[PDB]
Structure 1
Amino acid sequence: SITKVFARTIFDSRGNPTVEVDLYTSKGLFRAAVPSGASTGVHEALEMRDGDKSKYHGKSVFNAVKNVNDVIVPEIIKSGLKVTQQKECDEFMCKLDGTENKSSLGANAILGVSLAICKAGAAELGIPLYRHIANLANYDEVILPVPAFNVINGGSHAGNKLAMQEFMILPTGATSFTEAMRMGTEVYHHLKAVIKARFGLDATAVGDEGGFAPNILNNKDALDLIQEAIKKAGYTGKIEIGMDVAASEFYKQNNIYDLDFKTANNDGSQKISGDQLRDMYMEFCKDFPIVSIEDPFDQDDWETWSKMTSGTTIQIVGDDLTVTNPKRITTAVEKKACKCLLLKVNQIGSVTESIDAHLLAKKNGWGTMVSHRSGETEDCFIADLVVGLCTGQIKTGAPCRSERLAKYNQILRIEEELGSGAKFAGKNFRAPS
């Protein structure tokens, strides 16, 4: 039974406030922190912000904290639900909220308690959190994921001329997670050495996810830069590439995508149509070892999504397209729009829903890439979520900044626990099962 639930505000990796929940049972204290969400979102659960422009730039979360403290806490304690009853606790809070998007109490309020309950339930059962999540999703075995390291950025996420938002390296050729960390960091540092030489030390500064953002003129340069880094590290072949086009951010209208949206009066050549964009991806896939492309088209340009998923054999990740929303996931499934779900727990708002969202994707053949948010905390819950859900792939930032490393370090700790019987997703990261 839950004896006490208490929320407070802490600060995320970007200096913004966020909810942190302290939950007690006779086993003790179980702390959980919520990552940056969307106060306003397309189909995602809405995180509650105070909006007071004076206070913390309108990003304070006193209202969400209040909701946890004098609404959720009293109710859930009086409910008499055990931390061992995840589904029920989460349903309770959902009933308590009463809205589809959790806008009455705030997804950040509901998720904080939900994560704490999950950690508590695991303790209640005397098993590790990953094992607990495994059992919740009905998995008998667990597998260590291949890390998708963010290394170079673009789009709205930086200046430069890069249209594509993210460029990541996946150590699929590694034999273990330890080796994956070794490969990932070595390349990161080799990439930094390459970037500082080609663009100067100022280009060595990092963004929200710990990746670099040199003033690269084109997407191909980004890829070549990564290639050189992989070469210097001596891992060509063992390391593959992933991308997050986030084409939604750069879609004009009627099948038009402007690869140069970052300029006023864009009357240049990079104002191509979706079909031309799709071909560009095909060209990239031919020359570069690209094994995964996230959000290649607009979140509503279904037709081109299906065309690309139909003829490429690589992983096509849905993010803005699916927003960890079962309704959106179903549609993408029916339309065969993609083959991988980017799982963001705070996008849906609760642990069981996140698990169900994943199970839905899997049931229909998709892979699942567990994802972090731009505003993370020192909480490493998703590290246990990716191992327990047996997804084989997690995208939790570059191996720089501790809100990123917090997760990777945890997975290293889990790998240690599993011992020799620790399975690394490797090449079959897409669906290790």
Structure 2
Amino acid sequence: HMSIITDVYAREVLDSRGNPTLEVEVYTESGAFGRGMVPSGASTGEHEAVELRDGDKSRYLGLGTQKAVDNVNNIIAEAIIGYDVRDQQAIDRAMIALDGTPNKGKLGANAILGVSIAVARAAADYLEVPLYTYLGGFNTKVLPTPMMNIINGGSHSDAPIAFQEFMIMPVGAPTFKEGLRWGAEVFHALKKILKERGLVTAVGDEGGFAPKFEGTEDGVETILKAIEAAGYEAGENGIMIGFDCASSEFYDKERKVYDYTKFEGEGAAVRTSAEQVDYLEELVNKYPIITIEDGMDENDWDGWKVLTERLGKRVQLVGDDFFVTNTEYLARGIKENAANSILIKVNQIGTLTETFEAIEMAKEAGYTAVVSHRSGETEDSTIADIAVATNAGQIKTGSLSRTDRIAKYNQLLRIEDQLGEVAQYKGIKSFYNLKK
């Protein structure tokens, strides 16, 4: 009986940002082995999955993970030991039934996900195959095109700028290896411009800069000057730009209005939903834009309708906390024509099986699915294998600076080296929600 699970075990650890997270171990009778450690995130006033926190301000300002450790060691392990390591869907179903709440409150979502990942990795170790081969089968061949943060704003900045982040995409490169060097050469040219201009060159959580630019146009124009200094072309033959607006922040519920005076001065505008659509369209006509993330409130459904009708033929429009990785909201979005793309976060839902379920549903509707990091991260590299296993074509994996970001790019370089002449890179052809 070599494939039977003999034990599962958990301990407390730290993330990047120095806050308590959680790690899980799995062994078989043969001594095949896997580790699962969880990226950090919580939320409230929404149907996301819930983490446990200890709440005793004596330790780590109440942020410790000990009740989740106890749950793995005294309840889940007892019920899971004696399954086959390969019974993934029956294992993840047994955990949902065992918790028995809607949003995974008794056990916690952090406890359950770290079990779910360690089981998948232990099975790949038993069978002696790569983890993208275990997950996706044998068409696994397409390298994702990366969208990479370089400048920050809104709540992550002191500068007079509404939007949360700005990004570059190297859509014109011949391979993933050359595209990673196009990215890096623009990042080293931007740094030399900010030194000549006397601006801060330190970094935030995703590894990018937050300088005191003169306004929301000035960041965009500095990014284009760095692309030119690096020696490339702007537009579909070379490099292009994307935004995450996080627009649910600067929205007034009682006035029912978008109000730029939170992040910009007393002279900044007030805008209706029709003025929000008109403002987004001027930006799209003035600069090399290819994608916008959010751009409407979580609940401005009538605005998401008008926006998709105005811009959905030209530009990618992405739901994040609009959909929350949850299939019941995704379905209504597909029905009412509310976006053309979705962002994937494994810990918003909490199992591997419910995650792959949402990707196959989006794809059948002709939507794109983009896999993503969280702010606090570990030395885990699992989401790079999910991106290749499903041939999903795009990734959101941070800036060109820190190891919690760089480790994912370094794993993609080993997969493109393993796949040899089977390996494929799409560039602009990765946008099948456009090109229709």
Normalising by the smaller structure, the TM-score range is: over 0.9
- Equivalent residue number for residue 220 of structure 2: 223
The answer to whether 1:208 aligns with 2:205 is yes
Determine the C-alpha separation between the residues in 2 that align with 1:239 and 1:187.
10
- Equivalent residue number for residue 35 of structure 2: 31
**In the TM superposition, what whole-angstrom CA distance separates every residue of 1:278-313 from its partner, at most 9, and x where no partner exists?**
222111111222111111111111121122222222
How does the TM-score come out when normalised to structure 2? 0.93
- Equivalent residue number for residue 250 of structure 1: 250
SS in 2 for 1:103: coil
Aligned 1:107-256 pairs, distance under 5 A = 107-135=109-137, 140-200=139-199, 203-237=200-234, 238-253=238-253, 254-256=255-257
Give, in angstroms, the shift of residue 197 of structure 1: 2.4
SS in 2 for 1:3: strand
Unaligned runs of 5+ in 2: none
1:3/1:297 CA distance change after superposition, 3 Å: same
Letter in 1 for 2:429: N
Give, in angstroms, the shift of residue 40 of structure 1: 3.2
- Equivalent residue number for residue 353 of structure 2: 352
1:274/1:27 CA distance change after superposition, 3 Å: farther
SS in 1 for 2:261: coil
- Equivalent residue number for residue 56 of structure 2: 52
User: 2:9 touches 2:26 (CA, 8 Å); kept in 1?
Assistant: yes
User: 1:84 touches 1:125 (CA, 8 Å); kept in 2?
Assistant: no
User: 2:291 touches 2:315 (CA, 8 Å); kept in 1?
Assistant: yes
Determine the C-alpha separation between the residues in 1 that align with 2:72 and 2:274.
48
- Equivalent residue number for residue 63 of structure 1: 67
Letter in 2 for 1:241: I
- Equivalent residue number for residue 285 of structure 2: 286
1:51/1:270 CA distance change after superposition, 3 Å: farther
Say how many residue pairs are matched.
423
Determine the C-alpha separation between the residues in 1 that align with 2:256 and 2:198.
35
SS in 2 for 1:329: helix
- Equivalent residue number for residue 393 of structure 1: 394
- Equivalent residue number for residue 327 of structure 1: 328
Determine the C-alpha separation between the residues in 1 that align with 2:123 and 2:380.
17
1:101/1:283 CA distance change after superposition, 3 Å: same
User: 1:142 touches 1:389 (CA, 8 Å); kept in 2?
Assistant: no
Determine the C-alpha separation between the residues in 2 that align with 1:140 and 1:102.
34
**In the TM superposition, what whole-angstrom CA distance separates every residue of 1:29-61 from its partner, at most 9, and x where no partner exists?**
211210011153622111221122231122111
Letter in 1 for 2:163: M
- Equivalent residue number for residue 23 of structure 2: 20
Identity of aligned residues (%): 48
1:326/1:311 CA distance change after superposition, 3 Å: same
Letter in 1 for 2:40: S
1:69/1:365 CA distance change after superposition, 3 Å: same
Give, in angstroms, the shift of residue 255 of structure 1: 3.9
SS in 2 for 1:341: strand
Determine the C-alpha separation between the residues in 1 that align with 2:163 and 2:89.
38
Letter in 1 for 2:247: A
Determine the C-alpha separation between the residues in 2 that align with 1:322 and 1:271.
26
Which range is displaced more, 19-28 or 225-234?
19-28
How does the TM-score come out when normalised to structure 1? 0.93
User: 2:141 touches 2:419 (CA, 8 Å); kept in 1?
Assistant: no
Give, in angstroms, the shift of residue 408 of structure 1: 1.0
Determine the C-alpha separation between the residues in 2 that align with 1:52 and 1:336.
46
Letter in 1 for 2:67: N
Unaligned runs of 5+ in 1: none
- Equivalent residue number for residue 314 of structure 1: 315
Determine the C-alpha separation between the residues in 2 that align with 1:71 and 1:243.
44
The answer to whether 1:81 aligns with 2:80 is no
SS in 1 for 2:10: strand
